[PDB]
């Protein structure tokens, strides 16, 4: 895992390692992660134009490992070249089945609702990073608790919670959604920020803390 950062006006590479990891001594291993040539951070972009991929300048992003992965040579090699592909690899890639986004939001808790799609040319669509998470959460939430053919106790009882719209039912729905969302270890916490009623319609929203 890692933290994101950006190059500030005339910040030296020493300064970063000292502020995040405590000891200045660690900058030496820290430059290898960002694959930097000797002028590790340099102020001017027309100087970055010298050989753009091997430098960072003012306003560019940087990668900051956790201290356990700081010394790993494999983490060094991977962070050297992947650069922005970090986030995608770290939160996953899989096929996109949200083909009909307008449609699956008209029949949830019913089956047969999702479907493969095509993006690019001649290849099934795929989703990555944050949208990988939007897909899996939306599907998982709209799946009943014992309906996948292996590893059951997956999904929700949202199909079971339809009731007289009195507030106890609404807190019950809130708790089920929060349990649903907090099941995946990749998400830290969820909390409600609004629940709202319109006769026979529930509405509400939840904030989820995804790891960096």
Partner 1 sequence: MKTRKLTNILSKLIDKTMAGTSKITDFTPGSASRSLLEAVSLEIEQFYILTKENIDWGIQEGIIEAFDFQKRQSKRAYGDVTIQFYQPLDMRMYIPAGTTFTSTRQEYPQQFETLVDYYAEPDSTEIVVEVYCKETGVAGNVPEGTINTIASGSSLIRSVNNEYSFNTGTKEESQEDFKRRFHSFVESRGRATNKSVRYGALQIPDVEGVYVYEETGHITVFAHDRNGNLSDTLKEDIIDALQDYRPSGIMLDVTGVEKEEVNVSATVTISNKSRIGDTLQKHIESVIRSYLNNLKTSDDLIITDLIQAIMNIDDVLIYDVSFDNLDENIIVPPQGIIRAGEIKVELK
Partner 2 sequence: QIYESIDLDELNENGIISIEFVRNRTNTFFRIVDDVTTFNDKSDPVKAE
Partner 3 sequence: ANFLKNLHPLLRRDRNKKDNQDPNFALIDALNEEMNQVEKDAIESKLQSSLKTSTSEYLDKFGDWFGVYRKTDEKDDVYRARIIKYLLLKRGTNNAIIDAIKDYL
For partner 1, the binding residues (CB under 8 A) are 14, 24-25, 28, 37-38, 45-46, 48-49, 51-54, 81, 84, 95, 118, 120-124, 126
CB of 119 to partner 1, least distance (A): 8
The residue among 44 and 118 lying less far from partner 3, judged by its C-beta, is 118
3-state secondary structure of 84: coil
x/- track of binding to partner 2 for residues 168-207 (CB under 8 A): --------------------------------x-------
Contact 31, 13 (CB under 8 A): yes
Q: Which two tokens stand for residue 143?
A: 């799946």
Angle 105-106-108 (CA atoms, 0-180°, nearest 5)? 70
Give the contacts of 92 (CB within 8 A, at least 6 positions apart).
128, 132
Stretch of 85-93, 113-121, 167-175, 190-198 contacting partner 3, by CB under 8 A: 113-121
Q: Does 110 bind partner 2 (CB under 8 A)?
A: yes
- Considering only 57, 117, 126, 182, the residue that binds partner 3 (CB under 8 A) is 117
DSSP per residue, 26-82: GHHHHHHHTT--SS-EES-HHHHTTSGGG-EETT-EEEEE-HHHHS-HHHHHHHHHH
What is the contact surface with partner 3 in residues (CB under 8 A)? 97, 99, 111-118, 124, 139, 142-144, 147-149
């Amino acid at each position: 895992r890692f933290k994101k950062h950006v190059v500030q006006h005339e910040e030296t590479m020493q300064a970063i390692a000292q502020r995040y990891y405590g000891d200045v001594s660690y900058w030496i291993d820290l430059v290898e992660h960002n694959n930097l040539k000797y002028p590790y951070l340099v102020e001017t972009d027309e100087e970055k134009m010298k050989d753009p991929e091997r430098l960072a300048s003012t306003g560019d992003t940087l990668i900051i490992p956790i201290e356990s992965d700081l010394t790993d040579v494999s983490a060094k090699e991977i962070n050297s070249r992947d650069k922005d592909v970090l986030v995608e690899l770290a939160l996953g890639r899989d096929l996109n089945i949200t083909a009909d986004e307008k449609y699956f939001n008209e029949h949830g808790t019913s089956d047969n609702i999702l479907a493969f799609s095509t993006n690019g040319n001649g290849d099934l669509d795929t989703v990555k990073g944050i949208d990988n998470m939007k897909q899996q959460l939306q599907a998982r939430l709209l799946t009943p608790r014992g309906s996948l053919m292996l590893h059951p106790n997956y999904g929700s009882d949202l199909h079971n919670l339809f009731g007289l719209n009195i507030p106890e039912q609404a807190t019950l729905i809130e708790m089920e959604v929060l349990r649903t969302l907090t099941s995946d270890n990749r998400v830290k916490s969820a909390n409600l920020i609004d629940w709202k009623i319109q006769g026979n319609v529930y509405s509400g929203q939840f904030s989820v803390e995804i790891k960096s």
